[PDB]
C-alpha cells in the first residue's frame, strides 16, 4: 500500500529501464510472490533471474508492469496470480493501482461502479450542431 | 475535312514505299500500303479517324464498337447469371473459388443470347433490385 | 503554459507535438475555448482586414521595386527585345561568375529578369515614368495603413459589428454586386478612358491634367442626350503605334472586335467599352434583392418556391444552411474562384489584353501556369470546406428532405459512378497512349490511333475558323448568326483565321488523347473529393465520424484497419491528383506553345501521340539549356534557375519520408536519441522543457503533402521558366 | 415476436447490415435490451488486420427488424 | 530620372507607421 | 557586386538585418513566449 | 484422379487457361489478318 | 487523457477487458444482457488510445470507443 | 528438391536456348566481331524488329547474361 517489501531480482542490468523520468515525475514498481527461481524475459529487455519469494522490480511505465503482469499469468504452469502494480512518486508516496480493487478485472464483484456507461447506441449520438458553440464534445453531451 | 486522304497524299505516298514487315508474310507492308489507302491522313502521313458519327466514316469507330459492345456484353451476362446460379447450391464460397466448369462452360456457350435476355430480366424485374432491400451505407 | 492561448488541452501536454498542433489551429476558430458565436465572426472581419492590407502591401513591394531597381524607363523605349527587371541581388555568397552572369538586361548591378506580368500590365496602365508608380506604391502604402486601422476598430466594443449584421445576407449582396462588383469596374472604365487610351493615343494624362482636358471633343453631353455613335466615331486604325499619336483617332469606347496587329493584344477603348458594359448590368443586377426599402427579393421564398416531382423538397429550408453555417459560404466561394481563375488562365493566353505580352512568351507561360496551380488549389479547398461543413455544420431534421438531404441519400450510386466515368477514361486513355507508344517502339508509326477530334474541331468551326471546311454557323459566311450586322464581325473573323496568335490553336490528333486525359484528371480529383465530402458524415465502417471531427489519423487497425479514413485524408489523396493533373495539362500548354513560338507546330502534332514523345521532345530536349545553367567550365544566367530545378528535386522527394514511412518507426528511433542525450554526460547540462516525441500521424502526412507541393512547384518553376527563357532570351 | 429461422430486414442505420437479410437464430428472454439473435451470410468488417473473416451473429432489438419471413 | 534617395528613405517613413498599426491590430487579435 | 540604383547603401545593411538580425530575434522572443508558464 | 480435375477447375489455373486461349485466338487472328486499324 | 465510453449494446463477453494492456476497463454488474455485466472505464487517466478494445469487440460497430482527446506523459506512452 | 527442379528446368532453358536459337558457333568462329545472341522473336505484331542484325547474318536478341564466355571458358 505504502511501503514495498521486496528484493532485487538478479539481473547484469540495461539500457531501457529507468531513465531521468523516475526520480522527476513517477514510476511504477511490481511485486509479485514466485514459487521458484525461474528465468522471465522484462520489458525492458533480455532475461532476468526471477528470485525465491516476494520480490520487486521497478519500471517506468505501467505498460510494461502489466506486459510483465500478463507474462507472470500466462507463460509460467505455477501461474503466478498475486501480483500488485504500485505507482511510485519521487515524494515518496505510493498509489496502489492494480489490481486495486482486490479481485481481477476480467471478472465482475459487487463493489465497483459504472464509470464511463451510456444509456444509447452509437447510432442515437447528438448531431455536432446543435452543440456547435457549447464547448463540450458531441459524445460527452 | 481539312485532312487529304491516302490515296494522294505527298507524304503517305513517300512513307507506303518502306513499311516494315510486320509477321513474317514479306508483302505484309505492301498489303498495308494498300489498305491504309482509303484513310484519310493529316499534314503527317498517318491514317487518321473521323469518329463523329457519320457512316461512310463507321468502318473507323462503329463497326468494331458494337462489335465489343456484343463481346463485353457477353462477358458481363456470363459472369452475372453464373453467380446467380451460385446463390444457392450448399455453399457459394467454395462454388467462386473452384469453378463449376460444365455450369461455366454452358453459361459460356449459351451467352450469346445476352441483350434479349437483358430486355427480357430489365422488364421481369429480376435485373435491378429494389432501392430499399439494398445493403445500403449509413447516411 | 501560455502557448496555444486558444487551446487549453494544448497548453496541458509536455510533449513536443503541441507546439505544432498550436501552429496548426490557430485558424480554426470554431475549436477555441471560450468562443461564442459572434466572436467567431468579428475576429473573422478582423483577420479579414489584416489580410487585405497584407496583399496591398505586396502590392506596393512590386511597384516600389520596379520603381527603385527596374529598367521600367529603359523598357518602354523597346520592349521588344529589352528584358524587364524585378529586383537587384545582394547575397554575399556571389563570386565572380555569378556576378558577370546576372547583370544582365543592361545593368551594372545583379538584377533579376522579371517574368510576372507587372511591366506588361503598367505599360498597358499608361505608366511612364518611374515617378508616378512610386507614388503609387506610396499611396498603397497609405491605402494599406487605412485597411489595418479599420481592422483595428473593428475590433473595439464600441464599433463591434453584431451577429445580425453578419447574417444580414440581402443587405451586402446588393453592394457586392452594385458597390463593389459594379462602380468599381466603373470607376476602372473611368480611368481607362481618361489615362490608359490617351496615353496610347500619346497625350500625358496625369492628376494635374485630367481635370482640364476632356477624354473626348464631343465632351459629356452626348452620353446625356443619346447617339452614343460619336463615342465609337473614329478607332484607331492598323496603323497605329501604341504610346504615340500616330493614327490614332480620338474616340473612347470603339467595340472593334480581334487584335491590335502591332502590340497583338485587345484594343484598349474595347477594353473600356466591355467595363463599361459590364459596370451597367452589375449596377442593374445589384439592385435585386430586398433591404430596408420593401422593393426586391428576399432569398427565402425563393429557394422555398423551387420544388419538383424529381427534385423532392426543392431547395427548401436552405437559406439558413447556408447563412447560419461559414465553411458551407467558404466552399462556395472557392468553388467560384477557383472556376474563374482557370477562366483567367484560358483568357490571359488566348486573349491578351497587355501591351507586348504575346511576345514575351515566358512572361505568357509562367502567368498561365501560375493562375492554373492558383485554381487547381481553390478547387480542393471548396471540397474540403465541402466535407467540413458536412461534418461539423450539417443537421439533417431542418434539411430534411431537400436537395442536401437527397444528395446524400444516393452517395453510394454518385461516387460509384465517378468511379465508373474515372475507370471509363483511364483504362482507355493509357490504353491508347501504349498503343501508339508500342508501334511506334516497332517501327510502324502508320498503326497508331490518331482519332480526329472532330468536336472541338467543331466549335472552331463555329466561332470563326475556317480551316477545318466544316460550314457550321459561323465560317459558313450566309449563316443566320454572321450576316447580323454586329460591329465584332470583320475583326474577330480575321483574328481567327490569322494563324500567328495564340487564339483558337489548331487543334490536332494528340490534343483529343490530352483532353481525355484532363478529364480523367478532373473526374479523379472529383471522385475523391465527392468521396471525401459525403462520406465525411459516416460509411460503413465507422459511423461516427461527426463525432470524431474532420482530421483525425485512424480508428485502430481492427475492423480491417482503418488507415485514411477521415475526409482530411481524403483531401490528402486529392492533393496529390490535383498536383497530377495541374502538372499534365501545363505540360500539355507549354509543348503545344513551344511548338507554336518556335514555328515547329509538326514537332507537337506528330511526336505527342505517343509517351516517348513527351518523354524525349519535352522533358529530356528542352531541359537541356536548364541543367547546363553550370558546367566546369562556366556559369550562365540560368544556374538559378539549375539550382532551383535540384531543390525542388529534393523537396519532392523529402515528402517521401514522410509519406511512406510512418510514425511507430519514428517513435522507436526517438527513445534511442533521447536515450543517448540523457546518458552523455558533458550533454546532461542541457535539457529539454518539453518531452520531444516524434511528428503525429495526420500531421506528418500534412508535411509530406506539404514537401511534395512545394517540391513540385519549384522544379516546374524552374523548369517551365528557363527552357522557354533559353529558347527565346 | 418472432420465430427462430425466419427472415428479417435490419433498420439498424448505423450496422454492417442495414437493408440485408438475417434469420433469427433464437430470441432471448425478456427484460434485456438486445434480445433477437440474428445470424447473417455476410460477415462485416471485423477483428486485427489481415483476419480471414469477421462475425455475422448479432444481438438487435424488436423494433427496429422489418420481417419478411 | 530615376528614384532619388530621399524618395526611398520617405518610403521608408512612410512605411513605417503601417508596421506600428499592423502591430496594433495583431496585438488586439490576440487578446 | 554594386548598386547603381539610388541608395545602394541600404541594401547592404538590410539583408544581414532581415536574415539575421530579424530572424534571430523572432526566433528568441518566440521561444522565450512558446516555452514559459 | 478425383482431386485433379478440382485443381484444374480453380480460380488460378481456369482464369490462366482462359487467358491463354484468348491470347491464343488474338496471336492467329493477328497472324492471318495483321494490321488492322480500322474495318 | 482520452475518453473512453461504452455503450449499451455491450453483451458483457468481457473480451474488451482482457484485451486492453492497461487495466483501465473492468466488468462492473448490470441487467441489460444475457451475462449480467458490463464493462467499464474508471482510470481513463491510463489509457493510452491504443483502441485495442475496438479489436475485440462481437457487436455490430464495437459498443466501447476510443474518442482520442487530450494528451499527457501517460498518454502519449513516455519512458523519458 | 522443388527449388532444385526450378533451378535445374531454368539452367536446362540456357543451355537449350544455346544449342537451338543461338549463334555460338557462329560466334566461336568470329568472337571479336560479331555479338552473341541466344533468342529468336516471333514476327507477330511488328515485333520482329528486335531481331537485330548481331553479326553474321543472324537474326536475334543480343544477349547480356554473357554465359558464352562461360561456355568459352568450359570448353
Ligand atoms: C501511374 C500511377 C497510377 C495509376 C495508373 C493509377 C491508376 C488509378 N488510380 Mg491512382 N493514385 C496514384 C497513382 C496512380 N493511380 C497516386 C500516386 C495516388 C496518390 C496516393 C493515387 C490515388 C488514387 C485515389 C485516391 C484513387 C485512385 C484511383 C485510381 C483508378 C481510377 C482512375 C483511372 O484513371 O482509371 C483507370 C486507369 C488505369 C491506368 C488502370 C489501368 C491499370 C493497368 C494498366 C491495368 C492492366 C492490368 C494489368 C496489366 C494486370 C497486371 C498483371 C501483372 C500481375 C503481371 C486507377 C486504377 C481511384 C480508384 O481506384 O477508384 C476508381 C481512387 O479513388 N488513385
Ligand atoms: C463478371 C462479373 C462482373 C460484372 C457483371 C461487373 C459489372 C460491373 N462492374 Mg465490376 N468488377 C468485377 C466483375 C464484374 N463487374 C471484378 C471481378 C472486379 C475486380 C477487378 C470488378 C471491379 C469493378 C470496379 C472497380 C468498378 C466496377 C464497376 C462495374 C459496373 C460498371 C461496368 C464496368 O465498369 O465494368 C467493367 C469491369 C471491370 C473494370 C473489372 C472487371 C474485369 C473482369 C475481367 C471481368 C470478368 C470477371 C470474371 C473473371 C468473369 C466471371 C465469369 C464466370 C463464368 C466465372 C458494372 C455493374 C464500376 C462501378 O461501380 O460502376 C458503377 C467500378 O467502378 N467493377
Ligand atoms: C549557401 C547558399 C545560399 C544562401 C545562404 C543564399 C542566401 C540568399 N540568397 Mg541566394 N543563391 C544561391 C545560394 C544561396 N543563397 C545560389 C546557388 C543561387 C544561384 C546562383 C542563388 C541565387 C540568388 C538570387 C538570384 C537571389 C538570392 C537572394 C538571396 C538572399 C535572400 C534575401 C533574404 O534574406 O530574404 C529573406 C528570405 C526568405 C524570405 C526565404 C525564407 C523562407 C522561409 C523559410 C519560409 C517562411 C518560414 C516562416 C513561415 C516565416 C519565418 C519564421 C521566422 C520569422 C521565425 C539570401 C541572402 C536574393 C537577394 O539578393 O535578395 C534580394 C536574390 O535575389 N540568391
Ligand atoms: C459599396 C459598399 C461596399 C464595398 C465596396 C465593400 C467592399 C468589401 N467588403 Mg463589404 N459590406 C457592405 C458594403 C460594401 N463592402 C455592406 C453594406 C455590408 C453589410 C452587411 C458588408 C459586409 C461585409 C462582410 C461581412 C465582409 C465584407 C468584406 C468586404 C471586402 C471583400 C472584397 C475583397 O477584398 O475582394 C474584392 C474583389 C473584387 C473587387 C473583385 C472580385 C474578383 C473579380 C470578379 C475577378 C475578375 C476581375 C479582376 C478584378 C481582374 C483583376 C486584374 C488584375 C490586373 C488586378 C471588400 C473590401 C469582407 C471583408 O472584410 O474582407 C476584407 C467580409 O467578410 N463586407
Ligand atoms: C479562402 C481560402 C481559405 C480559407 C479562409 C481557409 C480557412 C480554413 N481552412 Mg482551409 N483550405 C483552403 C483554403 C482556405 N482555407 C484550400 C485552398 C485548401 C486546399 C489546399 C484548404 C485545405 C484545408 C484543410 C485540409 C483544412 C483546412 C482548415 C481550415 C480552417 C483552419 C485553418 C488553420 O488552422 O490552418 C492553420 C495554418 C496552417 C497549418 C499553415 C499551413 C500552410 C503553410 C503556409 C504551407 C507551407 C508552405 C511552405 C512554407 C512554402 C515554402 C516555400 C519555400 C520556403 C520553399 C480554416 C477555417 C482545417 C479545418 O477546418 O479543420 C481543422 C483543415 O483541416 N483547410
Ligand atoms: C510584401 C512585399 C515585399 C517583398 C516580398 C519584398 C522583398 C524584398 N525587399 Mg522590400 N519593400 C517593400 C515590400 C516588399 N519587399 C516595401 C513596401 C518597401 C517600402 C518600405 C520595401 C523597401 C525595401 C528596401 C528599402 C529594400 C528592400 C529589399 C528587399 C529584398 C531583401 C529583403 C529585405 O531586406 O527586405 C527588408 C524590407 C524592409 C525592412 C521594409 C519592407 C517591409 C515590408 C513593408 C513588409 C512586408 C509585409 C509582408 C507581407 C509580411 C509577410 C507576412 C508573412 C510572413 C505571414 C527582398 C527582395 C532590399 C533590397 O532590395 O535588397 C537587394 C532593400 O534594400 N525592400
Ligand atoms: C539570409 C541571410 C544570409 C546572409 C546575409 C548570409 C551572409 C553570409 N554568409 Mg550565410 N547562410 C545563410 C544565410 C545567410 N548568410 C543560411 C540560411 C545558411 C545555411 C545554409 C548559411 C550558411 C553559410 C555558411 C556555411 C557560410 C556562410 C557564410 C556567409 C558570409 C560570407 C562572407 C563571410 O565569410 O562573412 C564573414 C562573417 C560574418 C560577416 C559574420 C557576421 C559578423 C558581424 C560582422 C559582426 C557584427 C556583430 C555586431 C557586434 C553586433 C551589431 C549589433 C547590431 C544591432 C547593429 C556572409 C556574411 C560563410 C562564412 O564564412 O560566414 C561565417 C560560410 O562559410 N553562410
Ligand atoms: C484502349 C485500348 C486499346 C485499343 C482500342 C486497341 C486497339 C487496337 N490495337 Mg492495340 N494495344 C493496346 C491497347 C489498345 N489497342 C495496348 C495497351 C497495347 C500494348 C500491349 C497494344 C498493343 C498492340 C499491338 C502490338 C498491336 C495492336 C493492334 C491494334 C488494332 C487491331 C487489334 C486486332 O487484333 O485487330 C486495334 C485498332 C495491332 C495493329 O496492327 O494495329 C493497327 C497490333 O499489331 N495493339
Ligand atoms: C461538396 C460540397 C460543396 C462543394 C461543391 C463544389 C465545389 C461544387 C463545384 C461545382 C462547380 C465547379 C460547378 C461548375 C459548373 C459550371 C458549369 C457547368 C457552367 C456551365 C455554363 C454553361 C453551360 C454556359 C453556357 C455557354 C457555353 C458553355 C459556351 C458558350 C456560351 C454559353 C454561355 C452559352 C459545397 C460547397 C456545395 C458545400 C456542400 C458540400
Ligand atoms: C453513338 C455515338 C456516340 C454517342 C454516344 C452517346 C451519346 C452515349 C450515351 C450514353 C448513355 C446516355 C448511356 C446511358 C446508360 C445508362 C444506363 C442506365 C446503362 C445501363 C447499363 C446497365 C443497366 C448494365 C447492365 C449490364 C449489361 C447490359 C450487360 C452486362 C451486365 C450488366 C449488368 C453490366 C459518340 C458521340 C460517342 C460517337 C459516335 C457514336
Ligand atoms: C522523419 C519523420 C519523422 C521524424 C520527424 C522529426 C523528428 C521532426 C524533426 C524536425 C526537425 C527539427 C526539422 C524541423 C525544422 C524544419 C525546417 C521546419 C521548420 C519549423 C517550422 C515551425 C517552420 C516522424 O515523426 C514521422 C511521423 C510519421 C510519418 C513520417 C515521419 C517521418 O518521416
Not at chain 3, 521600367?72 to 558577370?100: C, M, S, T, Y
Not at chain 3, 453555417?325 to 474563374?340: R, T
Not at chain 3, 489548331?506 to 490534343?511: A, E, L, R, V, Y
Request: aromatic share 14%; net charge neutral.
Amino acid at each position: 500500500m505504502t511501503e514495498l517489501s521486496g528484493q532485487p531480482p538478479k539481473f547484469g542490468g540495461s539500457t531501457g529501464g529507468l531513465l531521468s523520468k523516475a526520480n522527476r515525475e513517477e514510476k511504477y514498481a511490481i511485486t509479485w510472490t514466485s514459487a521458484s527461481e525461474q528465468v522471465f524475459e522484462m520489458p525492458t529487455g533480455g532475461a532476468a533471474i526471477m528470485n525465491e519469494g516476494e520480490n520487486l522490480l521497478y519500471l517506468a511505465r505501467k505498460e510494461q508492469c502489466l506486459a510483465l503482469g500478463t507474462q507472470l499469468r500466462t507463460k509460467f504452469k505455477p501461474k503466478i496470480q498475486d501480483y500488485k502494480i504500485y505507482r511510485v512518486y519521487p515524494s515518496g508516496e505510493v498509489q496502489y493501482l492494480h489490481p486495486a480493487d482486490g479481485v481481477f478485472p476480467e471478472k465482475v464483484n459487487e463493489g465497483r461502479e459504472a464509470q464511463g456507461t451510456k444509456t444509447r447506441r452509437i447510432g442515437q449520438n447528438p448531431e455536432p450542431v446543435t452543440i456547435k458553440f457549447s464547448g463540450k464534445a458531441p459524445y460527452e453531451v | 475535312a481539312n485532312l487529304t486522304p491516302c490515296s494522294e497524299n505527298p507524304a503517305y505516298l513517300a512513307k507506303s514505299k518502306n513499311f516494315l514487315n510486320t509477321t513474317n508474310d514479306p508483302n505484309s507492308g505492301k498489303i498495308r500500303a494498300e489498305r491504309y489507302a482509303s484513310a484519310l491522313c493529316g499534314p503527317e502521313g498517318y491514317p487518321h479517324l473521323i469518329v463523329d458519327g457519320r457512316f461512310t466514316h463507321a468502318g473507323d469507330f462503329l463497326i468494331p464498337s458494337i462489335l465489343f459492345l456484343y463481346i463485353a456484353g457477353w462477358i458481363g451476362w456470363v459472369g452475372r447469371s453464373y453467380l446467380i446460379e451460385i446463390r444457392e447450391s450448399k455453399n457459394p464460397e467454395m462454388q467462386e473459388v473452384v469453378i463449376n466448369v460444365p455450369l461455366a462452360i454452358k453459361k459460356m456457350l449459351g451467352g450469346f443470347l445476352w441483350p434479349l435476355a437483358a430486355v427480357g430480366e430489365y422488364t421481369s424485374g429480376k435485373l435491378v433490385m429494389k432501392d430499399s432491400e439494398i445493403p445500403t451505407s449509413p447516411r | 503554459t501560455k502557448f496555444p492561448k486558444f487551446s487549453q488541452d494544448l497548453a496541458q501536454d509536455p510533449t513536443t507535438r503541441r507546439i505544432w498542433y498550436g501552429i496548426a489551429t490557430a485558424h480554426d476558430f470554431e475549436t477555441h475555448d471560450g468562443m461564442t458565436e459572434e466572436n467567431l465572426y468579428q475576429k473573422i472581419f478582423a483577420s479579414h482586414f489584416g489580410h487585405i492590407a497584407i496583399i496591398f502591401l505586396w502590392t506596393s513591394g512590386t511597384l516600389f521595386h520596379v520603381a527603385w531597381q527596374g529598367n521600367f524607363e529603359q523598357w518602354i523605349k523597346d520592349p521588344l527585345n529589352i528584358r524587364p527587371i524585378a529586383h537587384a541581388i545582394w547575397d554575399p555568397h556571389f563570386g565572380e561568375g555569378a556576378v558577370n552572369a546576372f547583370t544582365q538586361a543592361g545593368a551594372s548591378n545583379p538584377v533579376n529578369i522579371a517574368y510576372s506580368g507587372v511591366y506588361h500590365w503598367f505599360y498597358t496602365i499608361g505608366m511612364t515614368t518611374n515617378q508616378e508608380l512610386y507614388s503609387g506604391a506610396v499611396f498603397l502604402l497609405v491605402l494599406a495603413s487605412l485597411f489595418l486601422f479599420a481592422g483595428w476598430l473593428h475590433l473595439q466594443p464600441k464599433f463591434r459589428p453584431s451577429l445580425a449584421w453578419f447574417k444580414n445576407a440581402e443587405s451586402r449582396l446588393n453592394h457586392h454586386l452594385a458597390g463593389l462588383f459594379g462602380v468599381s469596374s466603373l470607376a476602372w472604365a473611368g480611368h481607362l478612358v481618361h489615362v490608359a487610351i490617351p496615353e496610347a493615343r500619346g497625350q500625358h494624362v496625369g492628376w494635374d491634367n485630367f481635370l482640364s482636358t476632356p477624354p473626348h471633343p464631343a465632351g459629356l453631353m452626348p452620353f446625356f442626350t443619346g447617339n452614343w455613335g460619336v463615342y465609337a466615331a473614329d478607332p484607331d486604325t492598323a496603323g497605329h503605334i501604341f504610346g504615340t499619336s500616330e493614327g490614332a483617332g480620338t474616340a473612347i469606347l470603339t467595340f472593334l472586335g480581334g487584335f491590335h496587329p502591332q502590340t497583338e493584344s485587345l484594343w484598349l477603348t474595347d477594353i473600356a467599352h466591355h467595363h463599361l458594359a459590364i459596370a451597367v448590368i452589375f449596377i442593374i443586377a445589384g439592385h435585386m434583392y430586398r433591404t430596408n426599402w420593401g422593393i426586391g427579393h428576399s432569398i427565402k421564398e425563393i429557394l422555398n418556391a423551387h420544388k419538383g416531382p424529381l427534385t423532392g423538397a426543392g431547395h427548401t429550408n436552405l437559406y439558413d444552411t447556408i447563412n447560419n453555417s461559414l465553411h458551407f459560404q467558404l466552399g462556395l466561394a472557392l468553388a467560384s474562384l477557383g472556376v474563374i481563375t482557370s477562366l483567367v488562365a484560358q483568357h490571359m493566353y488566348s486573349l491578351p489584353s497587355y501591351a507586348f505580352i504575346a511576345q514575351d512568351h515566358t512572361t505568357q507561360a509562367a502567368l498561365y501556369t501560375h493562375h492554373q496551380y492558383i485554381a487547381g488549389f481553390l478547387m480542393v479547398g471548396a471540397f474540403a470546406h465541402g466535407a467540413i461543413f458536412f461534418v461539423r455544420d450539417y443537421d439533417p431534421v431542418a434539411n430534411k428532405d431537400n436537395v442536401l438531404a437527397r444528395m446524400l441519400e444516393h452517395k453510394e450510386a454518385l461516387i460509384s459512378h465517378l468511379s465508373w466515368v474515372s475507370l471509363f477514361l483511364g483504362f482507355h486513355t493509357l490504353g491508347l497512349y501504349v498503343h501508339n507508344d508500342v508501334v511506334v517502339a516497332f517501327g510502324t508509326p502508320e498503326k497508331q490511333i490518331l482519332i480526329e477530334p472532330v468536336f472541338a474541331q467543331w466549335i472552331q468551326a463555329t466561332s470563326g475558323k475556317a480551316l477545318y471546311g466544316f460550314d457550321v454557323l459561323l465560317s459558313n459566311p450566309d449563316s443566320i448568326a454572321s450576316t447580323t450586322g454586329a460591329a465584332w464581325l470583320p475583326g474577330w473573323l480575321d483574328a481567327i483565321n490569322s494563324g500567328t496568335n495564340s487564339l483558337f490553336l489548331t487543334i490536332g490528333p494528340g490534343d483529343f488523347l490530352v483532353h481525355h486525359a484532363i478529364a480523367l484528371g478532373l473526374h479523379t480529383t472529383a471522385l475523391i473529393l465527392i468521396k471525401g465530402a459525403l462520406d465525411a458524415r459516416g460509411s460503413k465502417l465507422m459511423p461516427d465520424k461527426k463525432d470524431f471531427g474532420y482530421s483525425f489519423p485512424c480508428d485502430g487497425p481492427g475492423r480491417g484497419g482503418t488507415c485514411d479514413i477521415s475526409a482530411w485524408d481524403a483531401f490528402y489523396l486529392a492533393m496529390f491528383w490535383m498536383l497530377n493533373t495541374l502538372g499534365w495539362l501545363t505540360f500539355y500548354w507549354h509543348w503545344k506553345h513551344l511548338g507554336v513560338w518556335s514555328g515547329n507546330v509538326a514537332q507537337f502534332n506528330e511526336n505527342s501521340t505517343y509517351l516517348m514523345g513527351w518523354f524525349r521532345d519535352y522533358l529530356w530536349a528542352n531541359s537541356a539549356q536548364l541543367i547546363n545553367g553550370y558546367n566546369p567550365y562556366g556559369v550562365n544566367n540560368l544556374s538559378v534557375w539549375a539550382w532551383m530545378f535540384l531543390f525542388g528535386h529534393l523537396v519532392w522527394a523529402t515528402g517521401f519520408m514522410f509519406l511512406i514511412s510512418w510514425r511507430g518507426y519514428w517513435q522507436e528511433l526517438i527513445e534511442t536519441i533521447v536515450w543517448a542525450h540523457e546518458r552523455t554526460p558533458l550533454a546532461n547540462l542541457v535539457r529539454w522543457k518539453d518531452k520531444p516525441v516524434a511528428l503525429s500521424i495526420v500531421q506528418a502526412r500534412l508535411v509530406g503533402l506539404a514537401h511534395f507541393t512545394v517540391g513540385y512547384v519549384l522544379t516546374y518553376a524552374a523548369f517551365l521558366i528557363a527552357s522557354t527563357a533559353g529558347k527565346f532570351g | 415476436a418472432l420465430n427462430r429461422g425466419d427472415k428479417v430486414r435490419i433498420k439498424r442505420t448505423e450496422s454492417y447490415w442495414y437493408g440485408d437479410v438475417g434469420t433469427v437464430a433464437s430470441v432471448e428472454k425478456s427484460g434485456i435490451l438486445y434480445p433477437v439473435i440474428v445470424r447473417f451470410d455476410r460477415v462485416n468488417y471485423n477483428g486485427f488486420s489481415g483476419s480471414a473473416s469477421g462475425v455475422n451473429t448479432n444481438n438487435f432489438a424488436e423494433n427496429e427488424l422489418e420481417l419478411v419471413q | 530620372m530615376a528614384l532619388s534617395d530621399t524618395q526611398i528613405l520617405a518610403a521608408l517613413v512612410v512605411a513605417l507607421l503601417p508596421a506600428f498599426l499592423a502591430f496594433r491590430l495583431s496585438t488586439e487579435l490576440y487578446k | 557586386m554594386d548598386g547603381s540604383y539610388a541608395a545602394s547603401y541600404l541594401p547592404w545593411i538590410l539583408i544581414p538585418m532581415v536574415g539575421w538580425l530579424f530572424p534571430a530575434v523572432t526566433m528568441g522572443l518566440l521561444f522565450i513566449h512558446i516555452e514559459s508558464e | 484422379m478425383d482431386g485433379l480435375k478440382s485443381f484444374l477447375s480453380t480460380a488460378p489455373v481456369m482464369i490462366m487457361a482462359l487467358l491463354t486461349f484468348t491470347a491464343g485466338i488474338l496471336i492467329e487472328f493477328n497472324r492471318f489478318y495483321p494490321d488492322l486499324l480500322f474495318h | 487523457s482520452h475518453s473512453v465510453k461504452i455503450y449499451d449494446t455491450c453483451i458483457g463477453c468481457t473480451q474488451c477487458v482482457r484485451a486492453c494492456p492497461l487495466d483501465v476497463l473492468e466488468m462492473v454488474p448490470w441487467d441489460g444482457c444475457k451475462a449480467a455485466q458490463i464493462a467499464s472505464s474508471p482510470r481513463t487517466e491510463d489509457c493510452v488510445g491504443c483502441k485495442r478494445c475496438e479489436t475485440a469487440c462481437p457487436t455490430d460497430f464495437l459498443s466501447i470507443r476510443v474518442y482520442l482527446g487530450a494528451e499527457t506523459t501517460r498518454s502519449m506512452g513516455l519512458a523519458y | 528438391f522443388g527449388h532444385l527442379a526450378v533451378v535445374f528446368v531454368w539452367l536446362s532453358g540456357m543451355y537449350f536456348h544455346g544449342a537451338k536459337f543461338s549463334n555460338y558457333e557462329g560466334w566461336l568462329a568470329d568472337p571479336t566481331h560479331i555479338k552473341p545472341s541466344a533468342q529468336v522473336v516471333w514476327p507477330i505484331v511488328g515485333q520482329g524488329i528486335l531481331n537485330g542484325d548481331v553479326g553474321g547474318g543472324f537474326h536475334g536478341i543480343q544477349i547480356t547474361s554473357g554465359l558464352f564466355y562461360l561456355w568459352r571458358a568450359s570448353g
